[PDB]
Design a protein around this ligand. Structure first.
Ligand code: TAA
Ligand code: TAA
Lengths: 214, 220, 220, 214
């Protein structure tokens, strides 16, 4: 099969810059190479068809070139919404093949997270469970650590962390941390604390709640 | 508008078969080469095969012959892919796309997530996340919804039926042994809540579950 | 009627190239796959390539890439094949044929004789063949015409400008070193000759020759 | 390439009979096999499309069958106008290929040739050449031998023979034999003889002329 090698695998750039992505074919594919942009939770969007032809509706900042075995996608003046994976595809030989893709990430100024702590829902306590949720929203860079403290002691056990993809409008990240306890362990303690850790703020950001207060 | 509408996410048992649909509109169906591709989460696309709607002629990736079967229904402009002898490795998102020599793969369907597992569907438990009598006090207020212990993926989460699009962060589901859990947050101006109603809507296709969870100020 | 009309026979030198034409009518040109095939006298057909008239897309036999070039003219429903770097081995009859998934290769052109040679065009010597004072005596009388030493093929032989179709036997040209010789016979009722005029018409396109040879009783 | 083997290479049959021609693919071609009839001085005529589908306009006596690698063309009640080469063609794999063909010849009752001898045209003698022509028309079989005798001795040197196609109405053939001499050798002899030889007639058919008589 015609193998397509994309480079670089990942690229971090500042909005306003210009970049060029490379797509190599193990053999000639004539002008039958296409470029797609794929956002998470979305289907591929055709950017460039047949090596260099433009598509109605795609921003003029996108342009492609090359033929044979060497191809290039260029974006002059990268915007925030250009975040995503970029794939090249050849329709010259069967079977049709795609490249592994190039992940485009954007640079930004550091941003601290807006932290929010939420105690267990009363409906859940009734069923015997207790999930304490903490949102650390819109921060940059992605490096951020969350720590839980129950009555002042750190608990690692029971924590589920999840991060969103870089935001298309302001280039930040967000994450959620859920501490799952049984209704019994929960009713046995009073203070619940979530703290964000990362060299930006002079130190940690903390959010807490006391079970007793309602 | 020109559109390719795929069938809903499905859970199917190993060794069974599925028939995926792809309804089309807005473009000439007869001259279409309807393609089907497979994509495992966080990986590249794999081409499976195409069918020329005009002749019914098919071209298959040799790695999927004897596995996939494409057909077309010209009267309803719908394309179908019958995938057989499913194995857990066939779990992935399946797309249909239209190609034409003058446009490339310009039209794509939204994708259908097919899960091949022996396990049954477990609907999610939806919990409203309201702040306690202590936070908020600011111009912005964050509410949330916990979508816990469901299978299989995916679930869709909207707020106020899509009326509140801004300030929404829906986090990727995390697998906990054999069940998934996900959460979503929405930040609204204090002008909005608690005065007005903020409800999160959670849909779980595989179990035909549709829950609406209003976020009420926690008095308890 | 549905028809594929090809260009005339051509003589070309080695290392040269030709552009063959195939005018079509009677069928939808746009949905046509125009194929071009090579056939050496007394051998099987050789597929060279096809072009889809709708897109201009081409598919070539890997043995003829860099040698052949197909194009189409949708405004005049004509397809062309430009063959380059001709060698004497390229001498053969070339056909264009229409294919459709619906009908296979249903339409074929009449073929174009391509003679790749350095020899020169030589007009034929035309000789009337009349019987001597000794034969004939019967109800039927056979006259003939010898078309000797011409190049290249072909020549057209008719009798009385076509008025005389029955009883005609035109024999295949035989190559003698570098020149061709052919003969034709016509059998008419003694009623017809010598009372009336029997003339054999010989046309040799390549040299713009047109000869009329009346058959007269050989008094000498 | 997919190789197509046709059998038998040649077949002689009597009108009214039925016959089946075989076409075998080196590998499967599914139902993408077609059959053509080619008459000499004519382009191929499509007889059967996609292994067994009939073409409108074609005589019902023709029918094909098969799939995969084994195909057969059958003609029930062979007629006189059915002589020709029969080719099978596969349009399943690239490059498209054809079989070597099967030559169908019709048997007939022996027929003696109608012989005609023509002395050199006077115009030709003027130019220094002398071609003696002999037409052996409408005979059967094609294995008719022609011999030339000058003043009683046989001359093999200088003879050009040419045969036409089998007649469509009566399966008979015709041929022409031309002896080419220099004006000098011609004026040096008197009797010119052409004789047809073939087991049909109790013996040879002869035609002669004497240069002296005019
Ligand atoms: O008619 C019907 N089905 C049907 C009939 C024939 C085909 C083959 P095709 O798409 O024309 O093949 C093309 C085609 C074939 C031959 C051709 N030609 O001009 O020779 C042109 C196009 C081409 C497509 O890939 N094939 C190849 O390239 C092969 Cl050789 Cl690898 C497909 C489907 C039905 F009504 F019964 F359903
Ligand atoms: O757009 C123009 N011309 C033009 C554009 C693309 C092609 C290639 P195609 O005929 O669509 O290829 C087919 C095709 C390609 C892709 C496809 N698909 O659905 O992906 C369907 C059909 C196919 C034919 O053999 N190719 C292959 O099968 C390759 Cl993969 Cl071996 C040919 C011509 C114009 F600007 F000149 F108008």
């Amino acid at each position: 099969e015609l193998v397509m090698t994309q480079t670089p695998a990942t690229l971090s750039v500042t909005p306003g810059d210009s970049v060029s992505l490379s797509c190599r074919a193990s053999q000639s594919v004539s002008n039958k190479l296409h470029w797609y942009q794929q956002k998470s939770h979305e289907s591929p969007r055709l950017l460039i068809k047949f090596a260099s032809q433009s598509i109605p509706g795609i921003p003029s900042r996108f342009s492609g070139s090359g033929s044979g075995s060497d191809f290039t996608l260029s974006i002059n003046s990268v915007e925030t919404e250009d975040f995503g994976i970029y794939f090249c595809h050849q329709t010259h030989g069967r079977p049709l093949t795609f490249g592994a893709g190039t992940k485009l990430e954007l640079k930004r100024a550091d941003a601290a997270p807006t932290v929010s702590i939420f105690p267990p829902s009363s409906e859940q306590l009734t069923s015997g469970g207790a999930s304490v949720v903490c949102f650390l929203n819109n921060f940059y860079p992605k490096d951020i650590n969350v720590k839980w403290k129950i009555d002042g002691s750190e608990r690692q056990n029971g924590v589920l962390n999840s991060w969103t993809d870089q935001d298309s409008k302001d280039s930040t990240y967000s994450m959620s941390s859920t501490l799952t306890l049984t209704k019994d362990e929960y009713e046995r303690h009073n203070s619940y604390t979530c703290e964000a850790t990362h060299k930006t703020s002079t130190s940690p950001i903390v959010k807490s709640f006391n079970r007793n207060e309602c | 508008q020109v559109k390719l509408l795929e069938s809903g996410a499905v859970l199917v048992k190993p060794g069974a078969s599925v028939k995926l649909s792809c309804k089309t509109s807005g473009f000439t169906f007869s001259s279409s080469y309807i393609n089907w591709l497979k994509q495992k989460p966080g990986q590249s696309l794999e081409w499976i095969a195409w069918i020329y709607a005009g002749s019914g002629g098919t071209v298959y990736n040799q790695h999927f012959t004897d596995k996939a079967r494409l057909t077309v229904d010209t009267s309803s402009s719908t394309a179908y892919m019958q995938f057989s002898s499913l194995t857990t490795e066939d779990s992935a998102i399946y797309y249909c796309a239209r190609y034409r020599y003058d446009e490339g793969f310009a039209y794509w369907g939204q994708g259908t997530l097919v899960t091949v597992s022996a396990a049954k569907t477990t609907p999610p438990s939806v919990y409203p996340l309201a702040p306690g009598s202590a936070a908020q006090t600011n111009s912005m207020v964050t509410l949330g919804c916990l979508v816990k212990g469901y299978f299989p993926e995916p679930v869709t989460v909207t707020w106020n039926s899509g009326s509140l699009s801004s300030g929404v962060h829906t986090f990727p589901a995390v697998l906990q042994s054999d069940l998934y859990t996900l959460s979503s947050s929405v930040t609204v101006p204090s002008s909005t809540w608690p005065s007005e109603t903020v409800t999160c809507n959670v849909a779980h296709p595989a179990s035909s579950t549709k829950v609406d969870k209003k976020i009420v100020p926690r008095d308890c």
